[PDB]
A paper describes a structure:
We report a chemo-biocatalytic cascade for the synthesis of substituted pyrroles, driven by the action of an irreversible, thermostable, pyridoxal 5′-phosphate (PLP)-dependent, C–C bond-forming biocatalyst (ThAOS). The ThAOS catalyzes the Claisen-like condensation between various amino acids and acyl-CoA substrates to generate a range of α-aminoketones. Like other members of the AOS family, ThAOS forms a tight homodimer with the PLP cofactor bound at the interface between the two monomers, typical of type IV PLP-binding enzymes. We next characterized ThAOS thermostability, finding it stable at temperatures of up to 80 °C over 3 h.
Author numbering:
A (entry chain B): 3 to 396
B (entry chain A): -1 to 396
Amino acid sequence: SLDLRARVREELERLKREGLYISPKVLEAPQEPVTRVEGREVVNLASNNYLGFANHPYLKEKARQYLEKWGAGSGAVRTIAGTFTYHVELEEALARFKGTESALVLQSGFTANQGVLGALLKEGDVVFSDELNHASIIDGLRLTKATRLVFRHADVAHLEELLKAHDTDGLKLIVTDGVFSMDGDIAPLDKIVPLAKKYKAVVYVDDAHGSGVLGEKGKGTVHHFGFHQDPDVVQVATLSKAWAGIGGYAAGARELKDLLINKARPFLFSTSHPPAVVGALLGALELIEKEPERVERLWENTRYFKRELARLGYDTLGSQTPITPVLFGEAPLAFEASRLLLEEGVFAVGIGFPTVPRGKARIRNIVTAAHTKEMLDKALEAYEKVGKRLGIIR
Amino acid sequence: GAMGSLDLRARVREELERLKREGLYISPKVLEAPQEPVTRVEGREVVNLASNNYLGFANHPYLKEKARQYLEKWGAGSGAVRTIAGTFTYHVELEEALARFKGTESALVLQSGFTANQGVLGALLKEGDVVFSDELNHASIIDGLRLTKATRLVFRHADVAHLEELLKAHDTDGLKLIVTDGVFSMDGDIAPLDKIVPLAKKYKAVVYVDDAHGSGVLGEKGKGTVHHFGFHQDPDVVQVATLSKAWAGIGGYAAGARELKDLLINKARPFLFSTSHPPAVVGALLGALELIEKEPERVERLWENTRYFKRELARLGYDTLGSQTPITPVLFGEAPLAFEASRLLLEEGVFAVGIGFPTVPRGKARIRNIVTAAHTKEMLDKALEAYEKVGKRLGIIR
Ligand SMILES: *Cc1c(COP(=O)(O)O)cnc(C)c1O
Ligand SMILES: *Cc1c(COP(=O)(O)O)cnc(C)c1O
C-alpha cells in the first residue's frame, strides 16, 4: 500500500506534468479594484467584488455593531442552538429584497447546492443539467439518487428532446447556472421556464454571478426574467461575490424553507454564520437600496471595458455580464498573457483547458462598480501592449 | 402519472408530511442573547448546555477585539476563492499559527469542518483505494466518502479486533485509509488512536481523524486528540477539525505533513470552488489561539466542570453512555421521551436539545449536554436540579 507522501507526490507530479499545478498568489492589501500582489500595486480584475462592497466602510460598520453586540461565534448548527435573532433578520431582509416568499441562508453557495439539491431530489426523479454548470452543482447531484441527464450548453432544443424522452411520477428538475462563470453568458430562462411548464418540471437556478448584478437593483437573473414569484422556480446563490461576504441563500416558495430546515445536510450538520458576517450582509442589502447607482456604474464600466477591448481587436466571447473573458486561444498563451499583464500592473487570471475548451483559453476579467476610468484604461493600455507583442491584435 | 411530474409545493408537502409522521420534523429555537452558558430562549434566561462553546470563546472580548482589528484593516469580504484572488496575508497568518499550535508541519483552513472532510477525503482517495470507517463516524465523513470512488468498509464502533479482521481481508496496491471521529459527536467517547495507529502501521494504512470535538478540548492546551496520543508529527496521520466549536468561529482545518497542504490547494473541491473566509472570522480565530495560550487553565476548568456534571448525573441514576469528554449525553431511550424531557427542562430554565433516530440509534435517544469552561457551579447545579425534577416526573430515575 502507498503512504500519504507517496500518494501526494503521485497526484502532485501528475498535475505538474499535466501543466495543471497551481501556485496561488497572496494579496497584501484589501479586496479592492487596486490591491497589492508580490509587493506591487495592481489593477485587480481577478475578484468577484462586483459592487465594491468587500472593503466598504458601511458593511464594515454594520459588521462591527453585530460583532460587538453578539460575539465572534454562533457556537452551533441552526437546528440546535445556532439560530439567533440576527440570522432571522437577514433571512427576512433577503426574502424582501429577492421578492420571494422565503429565503434561507446556508454556509456557502458550494454547500447550498448540496443542501437544496439533496432536500429536493429522490430516487426516480430526473435532473436535466446544463453542460457547463458550476462544479458545486455536480457534487450536490452526486449525493442524490436522482437520474442525471446533461443538456448541451443553453441548448433548449436538446433540453426539450430530453424532457420529452424522460417522464417521471416524481420530480423533473432543470438545473442551470443563472450566469455562467467562465463565458459570462446568461441562462435562457425566457425559453427554459416555458419549456418547464410544458413538461411539468421545476427550474433550479444557481445565480452566484447574477445576484447583485442582473435584474432591477441587482435582484438577480430570475427577477430579470420576471419569475421570482413562481413557486416552481428555486434560486440558490452565494453571498460571497456581489454581496462581498460568505454564505449562500435558497429563495422561493414558503414550503421550500421548511423542507431545507428539516432535510438540508449542511444546514443540519455545519455551524451557522457568525455575527460579523451577518452584520456585513444586512449592511450590503441596506447599502444597495441607498445606492442603486452602484449597479448602474457596474454596467457602465462593463460596457466601456468590453467596447474598448473590441476596438483593440479582442474577442470577449459574447459575454453579457461584467464577466469579461479576453480570448487568447491556447492555454500557454493565455498564461503568458496573464504573466505579461502582471508585469504591467494588471492582475487577471489566465484560464485554459480543462477548465475551458481547448482553443478557448482566456484571461478572465471581472469588472466592478469600484473600478475608475483610469483603472480600466490602465488595464486597456496593458492589454494593448501585451496583445500587440503576442500577435493576437495588430 | 396522469397529472404529470410533481410541482415543488407537492414534493415539499409529501416530504414534510413524511417527516411529521416519522417524528423527524424540527422547529429550532431562536436564541435572543449571545452564545454563553446563560442565554435567552423564548423571552426567558436559561442555562444553556446545547452549544459547542467549550472554552467560552463565542462572546469573549479578546476574540471580539482581535476580530474588530482585522475587520477594520481588511474589510467585510475576501471576494474570491483562495486559488485566484482570495488568499490574503491574514489567511497565511492563521495557517502558520494553527500548524505551530497543532505541532504539525502544515495546516490549511477550509470553508467548514463539514466541507473539510469532502476536500481532504476527495483529494486523498482514488478508485481501488480501501477505506475502513468507524460505524458511528459523523455525517460529514459519510458525504466526503460518497464523493470518492474508494472501496468503503465499516468497522463496528471502536472495535480494533474487527478493524484488524477487515485490514487482513482487504488489501490494495493503492491507499488504505482508516477514518474515525477523534471525539464522537453523539456519545462523546474518544477514538482508541493508541490501538488504531499501531494497527495502521502493521497493515500499511494511513489514519484520518475528524477531531471536531477534540480540538480545543483534549491534549495539552487543547491541541487535540492526535496530540493527546502523541501522533502529531506522524506524516501518515491526517487531522481535520472545525474552527466552529472550541475555537468559536467558522471554518475547518486540515493539518499534517507539508505535502498534504500542497495536494489540498490543488485538489480539494471546497478549496477550489468556494470563497475564502473574511477578516473578522480569521481575526477572531487568531485571537482564540492567543487566548488559549494566555489562559490554558480554561481547559482545566472545562474538565473539572465535566467530571462534576457526569458524577452528579450518575448519582441521580442517569446513564451518560460511557461519554469521556465534555459531551455528556443523558439517555432517555425513545425519541419522544427525549423530546418531552427537553421540553420539561426548558420549563425549568434549562436548554438542552433531544436527539433521536436517525442521528443516533433507535432506543438510544438522548439529550446532548455540552459542559463548557464558562459554566459555573450554580449553573451546573441548576441543570442537575432540573434533570432531577424532570427525571422523577418521567419515571426514569427514582
Ligand atoms: C461539528 C462537526 C463537523 C462539522 O464542522 P462545521 O465546521 O460545523 O461544518 C464535522 N465533523 C464532526 C465530527 C463534527 O463534530
Ligand atoms: C461562486 C459560485 C459558487 C460557490 O459559492 P461559494 O459561496 O463561494 O461557496 C457556487 N455556484 C456558482 C455558480 C458560483 O459561481
